[PDB]
Design a protein around this ligand. Structure first.
Ligand SMILES: *[C@@H]1O[C@H](CO)[C@@H](O[C@@H]2O[C@H](CO)[C@@H](O)[C@H](O)[C@H]2NC(C)=O)[C@H](O)[C@H]1NC(C)=O
Ligand SMILES: *[C@@H]1O[C@H](CO)[C@@H](O[C@@H]2O[C@H](CO)[C@@H](O)[C@H](O)[C@H]2NC(C)=O)[C@H](O)[C@H]1NC(C)=O
Ligand SMILES: *[C@@H]1O[C@H](CO)[C@@H](O)[C@H](O)[C@H]1NC(C)=O
Ligand SMILES: *[C@@H]1O[C@H](CO)[C@@H](O)[C@H](O)[C@H]1NC(C)=O
Lengths: 50, 37, 50
């Protein structure tokens, strides 16, 4: 939906209210998103680690 | 069709306490397990 | 049929109550549980304890 980024997308267990599209963590980065065509929630995890 | 009603008794106003009422979601972002200021 | 009046004295009220309060600009501390619901809040200007 215009929000760009990089990472790994995985199936999620969070459950958004109908007026919500993005989810943010404590550092205010987007870590969850609702897919605009299948209406399923996805988690976004960074790629570099270790 | 517009009337001025009657048969109404007089009384002073009444007040009450709001016990931590009236909070709303301030954005449309999802947050979980957090304390947000 | 129990409200004779004419049209300005023949009416019964019913039963309801409503309460009115006014908002002001405050700082609150909201608590989101794991499901994403706000379950508690702290009014940061009510007392020194808060
Ligand atoms: C968006 O369009 C896609 C197709 O372009 C729709 O996907 C269909 O979804 C139904 C589920 O009810 C499937 O049975 C179809 O096979 C899907 N089609 C394809 C081509 O995969 C999708 O439903 C549309 N969005 C909405 C909200 O209806
Ligand atoms: C209901 O009561 C009000 C008074 O509380 C009446 O008001 C006046 O209305 C005339 C026009 O008709 C104005 O020129 C006056 O200036 C108003 N005075 C005040 C104090 O409001 C009103 O006419 C009444 N209406 C009915 C249907 O009874
Ligand atoms: C609310 O304000 C009015 C103003 O006079 C006062 O009389 C009343 O006691 C107040 N109520 C409370 C619960 O403080
Ligand atoms: C949400 O959390 C409540 C307890 O705070 C729990 O009872 C409920 O099952 C949870 N909802 C689910 C199952 O996602």
């Amino acid at each position: 939906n215009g929000l760009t980024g990089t990472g790994v997308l995985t199936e999620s267990n969070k459950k958004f209210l109908p007026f919500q599209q993005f989810g943010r963590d404590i550092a205010d980065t987007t870590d969850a998103v609702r897919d605009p065509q299948t209406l399923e929630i996805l988690d976004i995890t960074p790629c570099s680690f270790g | 069709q517009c009337v001025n009603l009657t048969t109404r008794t007089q009384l002073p106003p009444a007040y009450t306490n709001s016990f931590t009422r009236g909070v709303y979601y301030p954005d449309k972002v999802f947050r979980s397990s957090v304390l947000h200021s | 049929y129990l409200t004779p009046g004419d049209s300005s004295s023949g009416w019964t009220a019913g039963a309801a109550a409503y309460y009115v309060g006014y908002l002001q600009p405050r700082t609150f501390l909201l608590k989101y549980n794991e499901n994403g619901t706000i379950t508690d809040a702290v009014d940061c200007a009510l007392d020194p304890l808060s």
